[PDB]
Design an enzyme around this catalytic site. Sequence first.
Site, PDB file in Angstrom:
ATOM      1  N   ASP A  43     -51.187  67.138 129.105  1.00 52.71           N
ATOM      2  CA  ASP A  43     -51.092  68.262 128.964  1.00 52.71           C
ATOM      3  C   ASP A  43     -52.175  68.783 129.823  1.00 52.71           C
ATOM      4  OD1 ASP A  43     -50.595  70.972 127.878  1.00 52.71           O
ATOM      5  OD2 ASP A  43     -51.193  70.356 125.828  1.00 52.71           O
ATOM      6  N   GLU A  80     -53.308  71.251 135.249  1.00 53.29           N
ATOM      7  CA  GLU A  80     -53.421  72.061 136.194  1.00 53.29           C
ATOM      8  C   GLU A  80     -54.798  71.526 137.058  1.00 53.29           C
ATOM      9  OE1 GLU A  80     -52.931  73.382 133.252  1.00 53.29           O
ATOM     10  OE2 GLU A  80     -50.794  73.911 133.308  1.00 53.29           O
ATOM     11  N   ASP A  84     -47.175  77.467 128.250  1.00 54.51           N
ATOM     12  CA  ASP A  84     -47.275  78.391 127.034  1.00 54.51           C
ATOM     13  C   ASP A  84     -46.823  79.838 127.206  1.00 54.51           C
ATOM     14  OD1 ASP A  84     -48.514  76.048 126.150  1.00 54.51           O
ATOM     15  OD2 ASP A  84     -50.533  76.755 126.325  1.00 54.51           O
TER      16      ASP A  84
HETATM   17  O1  LIG Z   1     -47.471  73.214 124.499  1.00 53.29           O
HETATM   18  C1  LIG Z   1     -48.912  73.399 124.178  1.00 53.29           C
HETATM   19  C2  LIG Z   1     -49.802  73.013 125.253  1.00 53.29           C
HETATM   20  O2  LIG Z   1     -49.347  73.842 126.313  1.00 53.29           O
HETATM   21  C3  LIG Z   1     -51.169  73.182 125.166  1.00 53.29           C
HETATM   22  O3  LIG Z   1     -51.416  74.622 124.909  1.00 53.29           O
HETATM   23  O4  LIG Z   1     -51.431  72.497 124.014  1.00 53.29           O
HETATM   24  C4  LIG Z   1     -50.701  72.664 122.803  1.00 53.29           C
HETATM   25  C5  LIG Z   1     -49.008  72.401 122.895  1.00 53.29           C
HETATM   26  O5  LIG Z   1     -48.524  72.842 121.774  1.00 53.29           O
END
Ligand SMILES: O[C@@H]1[C@@H](O)[C@@H](O)OC[C@H]1O
Lengths: 676, 682, 677
Positions: free
Chosen positions: A387, A390, A457
């Site tokens: 996650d 970027e 998100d």
């Molecule tokens: O998908 C979400 C991700 O993009 C980040 O914000 O961490 C929390 C996860 O639920």
Amino acid sequence: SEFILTSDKLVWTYDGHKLQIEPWGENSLRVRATVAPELNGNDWALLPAKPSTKVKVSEFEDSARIVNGNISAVVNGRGQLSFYNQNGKLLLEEYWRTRFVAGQGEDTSSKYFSPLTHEARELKPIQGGKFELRARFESQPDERIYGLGQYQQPFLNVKGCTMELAQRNSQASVPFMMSSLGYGMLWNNPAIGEVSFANNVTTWMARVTEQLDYWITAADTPAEISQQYAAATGAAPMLPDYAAGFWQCKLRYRTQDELMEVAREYKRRSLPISVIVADFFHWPNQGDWCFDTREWPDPKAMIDELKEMGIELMVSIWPTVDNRTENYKIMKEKGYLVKAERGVPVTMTFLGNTTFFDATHPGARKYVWEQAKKNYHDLGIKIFWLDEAEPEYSVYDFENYRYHLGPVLEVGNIYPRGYAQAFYEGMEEAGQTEIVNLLRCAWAGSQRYGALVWSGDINSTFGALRNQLMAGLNMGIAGIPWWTTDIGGFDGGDINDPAFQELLIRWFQWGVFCPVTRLHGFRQPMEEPAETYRDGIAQCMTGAANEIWSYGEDNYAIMKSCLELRERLRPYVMRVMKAAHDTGAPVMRPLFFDFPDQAEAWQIEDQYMFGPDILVAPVLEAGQRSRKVWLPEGCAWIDLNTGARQNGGQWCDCDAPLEAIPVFIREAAAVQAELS
Amino acid sequence: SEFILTSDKLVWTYDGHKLQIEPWGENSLRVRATVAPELNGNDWALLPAKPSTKVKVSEFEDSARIVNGNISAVVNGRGQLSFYNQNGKLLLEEYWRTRFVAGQGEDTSSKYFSPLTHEARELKPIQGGKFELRARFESQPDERIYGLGQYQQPFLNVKGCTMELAQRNSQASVPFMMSSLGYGMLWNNPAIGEVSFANNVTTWMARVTEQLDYWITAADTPAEISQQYAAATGAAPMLPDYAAGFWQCKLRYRTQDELMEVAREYKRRSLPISVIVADFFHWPNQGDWCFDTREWPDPKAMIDELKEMGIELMVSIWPTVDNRTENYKIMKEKGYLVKAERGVPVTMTFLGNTTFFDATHPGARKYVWEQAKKNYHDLGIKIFWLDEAEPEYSVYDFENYRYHLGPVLEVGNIYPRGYAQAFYEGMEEAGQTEIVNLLRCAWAGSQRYGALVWSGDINSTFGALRNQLMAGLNMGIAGIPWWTTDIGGFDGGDINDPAFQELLIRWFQWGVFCPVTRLHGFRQPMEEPAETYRDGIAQCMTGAANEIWSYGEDNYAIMKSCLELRERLRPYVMRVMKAAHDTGAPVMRPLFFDFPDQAEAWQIEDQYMFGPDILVAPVLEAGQRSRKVWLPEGCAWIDLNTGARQNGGQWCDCDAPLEAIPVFIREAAAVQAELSIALEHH
Amino acid sequence: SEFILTSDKLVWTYDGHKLQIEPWGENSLRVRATVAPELNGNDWALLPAKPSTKVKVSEFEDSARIVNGNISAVVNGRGQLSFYNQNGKLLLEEYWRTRFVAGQGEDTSSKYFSPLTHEARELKPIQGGKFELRARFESQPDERIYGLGQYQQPFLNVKGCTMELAQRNSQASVPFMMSSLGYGMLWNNPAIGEVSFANNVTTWMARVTEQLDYWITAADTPAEISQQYAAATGAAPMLPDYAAGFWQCKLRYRTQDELMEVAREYKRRSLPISVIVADFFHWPNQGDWCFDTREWPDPKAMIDELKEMGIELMVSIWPTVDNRTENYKIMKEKGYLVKAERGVPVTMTFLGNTTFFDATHPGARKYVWEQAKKNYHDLGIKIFWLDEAEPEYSVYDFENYRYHLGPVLEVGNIYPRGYAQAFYEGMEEAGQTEIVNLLRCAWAGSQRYGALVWSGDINSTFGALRNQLMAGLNMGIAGIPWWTTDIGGFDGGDINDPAFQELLIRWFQWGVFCPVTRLHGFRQPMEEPAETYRDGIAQCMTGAANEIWSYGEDNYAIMKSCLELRERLRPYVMRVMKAAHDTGAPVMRPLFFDFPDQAEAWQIEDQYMFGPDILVAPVLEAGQRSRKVWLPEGCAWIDLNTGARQNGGQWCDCDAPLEAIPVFIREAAAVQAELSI
Ligand SMILES: O[C@@H]1[C@@H](O)[C@@H](O)OC[C@H]1O
């Protein structure tokens, strides 16, 4: 103006400007240009080329030419470049607007003659530094353009659009494009910048770079272009079987017991479930990369019970390192962290002052992998959720950050590739085959490191769903076959709201015909943590429940049947995944990929092919109970929901009740028998 | 080349460059230059000038001249500027090194002729932006230079030194210089930059600015230069009487009870004490600007009892605003915070992510004052400790921050003046007269806002002590008469260590003869807080004890007698403070201020005058028990410790036991009687 | 904090900062630091090091140490560096002012403890780019500093001075310094910047660079430091015989006939003359690099006749290429020209819009040499006047220009070295030995390319003369032994003005005891050209006459005996030149070079040693007819003008009439025997 020609390389030079064109795989050329003394050794996304047998370099009149199979490049005496296919048709030509070029007057009979003074290969020196690059090409009135990665916009054809070449949450720059004129082009340059496919001129820009570098390929079909691109930047590996099943997730299962109770409920009801996921802040602090034993008392016992149930556990990895941790201290000593150019040495302020690990530093990659190996992989976790890929700077001031490979302005876009590489190389060295990790972002070639990308998100609306369809299709064109979304979107869905429940169903029905079927989100009503802080560390909230039984019985029955449909689809999905590995074809494809000779296939943006045999027509509006579906010519089509036979080459008004979206199967394809 | 002359203004121009010279108070000129269409309206530290009646502007040959009392400026036809006094002596000369200037060939017989191509007034355009300014002047072989503010370096005379024009913890740029050639110069420009008084050339630099602006003044004595400077930037107010007594402080009295135990124990031992201080992190969070009632349950009762005891409370003010506070939310809504140009919007990370209030924003000054008024001043607190006054960015990347008045690069150095101004104007508006606040930093003119400056978080060494003497004297020359230190230094003194105890005593003895006598520091062994966090807010540690009885009985006796001596000195201190208010003279002065005709007065850097009547010769080395002391000519001197009489104009080999430093009193000055200096026959 | 130690290398690292210290010649260390992945391959002025005898690396407590003969470097656990000699004496220490460094709290008992937060090795990232570098060292109370190159300032000791690290007309950054504390230091970095020897702190600055790089050396005497420096950056070659004689020049001999008539007159009067010079704009256009046949009809005949007369011809080379020329077109085709970053593609506007050839480009060096070879060297010309060597941008906006090796801000100061290199390598390849060319500028190591440096287009005043003395001495300390000036200065001297005439005599007298004795200038009254343009090309003016007979008979008599005195010194000059080649010692030296143990030798800046045997005390003021002269202890001194013996270790009032300056010879030195024979 001077040509330096060999049997397999065209070089042109004037005033220190070197333009170098050479074969780089069948039907493909690499183009480079610099005003530095020589070209550097940066290959970025391009793998070593398999030698071309058919390359031919020629000289004629004042020009030079290089042919490699179905593509040729012509450079005139003024150093101006254009590309043609094997039939002699124009693919792409440089954009020049000058009265004087390469020490010569410009030809007044050409559209190149202009006082404006724009060069096609503008290497503009930055004072004290490197170069600001603009590569300009003529637009064409009939040119349709696809790929470029994942952008949050309702356009499949991106002719007329301008795309930022930067990585942000919900965006991925994967700068391979495919043109309807019969070529593909990779901007082989990780610099922050922009690509504008404006009606009046095409401009690629790099804010800071050493040299121009791109790769161009020609073929009579999209499929061949995709294949040639995959040979250039790397094949997707084989998808492991378990990845084709259902992935259950939410923000967030806060404890081992909470997660296990969901898995047990799936098994209690004999529902399909292949992967279950522990989301973020299951750890003591950012940079520990381990389970917090207060909420996760016995991770091994969780993994073992899940294994008995036939379920794989995926765990959240954040690339952040909180400055109070032991790993911050050691990574700081070794120089394994990203650096702020100015101001406080903090790259993100979410629940702590953190600094990202440097995914472009080979040492930092190894360090982070070995932490994840010790605390997760050694326990039997074999899928990681990479996650914040970027990475998600609290403020996207790209100029203010520096990596091992240089300033983020110069190299920043390759971060997500390195992040995926860290885990893929680590897992491969630990003996794992058929690796897949969930990445939030990618660059060119990320597919070779097993990157299953999802679109981040986004909000929970029909407008978002429409954008995701376009983005996923364009990601496939950009060479990223493993792609998915949060079913229902990420942010704003209340589980008790009928309107959201309708969106959820429509998105789920689409998700059955996505490369991976994955339920995730941050559902309302959210719940704050009981304690705001514990040991001075800010605690992470949760959303509401997000299981297929959480939205009432009517919605349960629909989603249950969706899961059963996805299970019946699995052999077909594995066939299409093997084809992606073998040939570079996307899994979810625009219509023109399978029907490139048909005009309508290049126009329709609300239908697609899920592999070669399934035509999918998602419902993209609230309240819609029917829609028009174009059936491609050349085969008959079987309605998945009625079994009715329809001839190709017609528009049909299709029933689209809440319980099904229109889907058609190519007649006599093996998947037809598999689905009824 | 063109002169535009009136009866009281000289302007020269060529190619958009405008040079404007005009009177700005008696014996003084203002010099401005720009390549913009016109001069802007920024006066920075300069107050409006009283009209000069006999100003004379002339032109002769190809040149022009403006005379104002004891100073004259001459601009030649090439726009090159030099300054002279009434005796025709050269004070200051522009540095030019060109073959072609103002559209004309340079004179080959002049030192100005050179292919190098350096301009004296270099306004170098910043692309897309304003100007990078370098103002170059010829160096002079026997020029000695003083002032510039507060720098951590063992040099009183700074000819040959280079000083950063920036504010950092323990540094204060107050860019007024005084030269031994008989002039003073204010660099009236708050930009981040540098002044190098190199032997080969003097260069003032501003990173970002709209225009050149300086003020220059000439007189026959230092005292006159200091007077003329105070008229230009503002007089120090009269010091309140309590400020001449003893200030007791440490990092940190954590509770109301702990602070009051120390106050009562001072009274119980019949010891002098005028101010006691509540240090930082007595508040719930940064930006609340109030007592935390958990540790300070009844602030009113504390203040009332201290008032019965004859003691003033001072409280720590930090300019930080933590992003979880209510004042952050409101101050963000109103635009009252400093802004980062790039990266996370956080200017300091000490015990929380904070952003500084913008002391250059008039609305923000008023907002912070009114918080302090509601929570402190209305309860009867009359003194504020304006800490972190630079402000103390966690990283001093000046290019990365912006204020209401512009980028920190252009206007940054004026922040501590605005911070002082916020509290001074507010306290004055509330009806308080004779205001003094403890500021960590300053700019030109800070003195007019009651700024008692102290030299920040220095280490506890004899090296530091030596630096502070030089810094304190140069601050006085820079027009900041109210100045002090942490006695013993801030960082590194262990209370049980004999080596630190030695230093503490010498520094305390010096402190008796500083403008304010103030005990403070962060003493070892330090104690971590019981809870590292409370409500998610990081908690602040404390150092060890730092009262005069905390270092054993033998040291207690010495410091006790130091306090008693300071009390006897108070009437004299208040007379010298009045003289600073009336004449702009510093309180602690180099020897040349009182004895400018004597060569040794311009050479000696380890002695000073504490007012006109007390010669101080501090001990600045461990183990030293005697030192040489030069006694100035023109009067007789009374040894404070023995009572012996010594004639002026000689070097004495003076005794300097642990119990006293060499101090001499001008014979028959009123302070001699006040000090009660006996001479017994045993 | 981590040390990586091998037998002959000390590396320390924290947070990607790599500090690397290693031997680089006897009694010498090289220091490099970077925050990039690795050190780059740029050695700039440093030649490959001879491997050292006794190098020892060791770790002790939380520190590490590297010793190489008479120098050692200590790096503590906070990455803080200091240097010591074989007697344990502190030579140089880094300046740190922080509370926290290398992940650790700073020691509160140290002067390094401070909230100011200044690093000794500050590699400040430039956004999108490389690094702005500041290297800080503590100042020391009695440190006296020499060298740095050629600056226009009346200071021999440059402690307290700030010097620009840039190349401008009359200035040369040659950044080797020698300290009275017993070390020398080369700032091995060609970036535009500054060195500040302030009383409160020493700061070296580079505007743009990839990494920190310096070389430091220790020895008990100045002579050993100079030797160690010459080993590191290259020895001066042996000077050819003709260079020690008289060089006759002016701005400018416009025609072959005019130059030859001056040469013939010198020979006709039996006056010494070894070199005569064709100044600038003897060419059709800038970038042609050939004689204009309209003014110079038979160049080969001129050179042959001068050969018969015992005279070498030197010709002006300008590095400018006018945009109308054939060579502009070809050099622009090949990328051999300097580039403007912004604005019109013109680097200089003097008598045409020109662009400089890129001396950092190996191909451009070779191209320009081969033009000069074809049109000058093949005819028999053996000396080139490499003028405008900085190069002289019409505007010194260093940020606006770029070379082959990078932006001028990063690499600019090495240009004059490249310019000298172009002609030295070419002339050597062509079969010439003992090469000397006249360069207006230099960088570190320029001496190895036969660079006779002169101090450029200074004005004709006594102020300028005082500056030149200091500059020339400091150039010698910086390792440039072949140095000279325009006798009389360049600009402002009217040949009919008695004030200038007195300056000229004093400057000539000093010139006899300069490494090269060369008359040049742009004398008034100047004469405009007959027509302003010819073929659209702006024509170059000339100054008035500048021969030793051009200033009246009484002045002619003085300058005549100066030339005769110089010829008598030539054997001694050639011996001192050989010693410069063998040992790296300068020709004109400060007193401390030959008398390092004597306090006065480190204080006196208006006397010097011309080799080890001649004490020179020039007159540096108008109307001065006597002056004070300190005679060094340890030997007796023979007055050159009277023959009177004087004991060393005293001050003398010396007669200094217009006809001589006070000069003294070491008693029983070979040069005493040569001057009295
Ligand atoms: O998908 C979400 C991700 O993009 C980040 O914000 O961490 C929390 C996860 O639920």
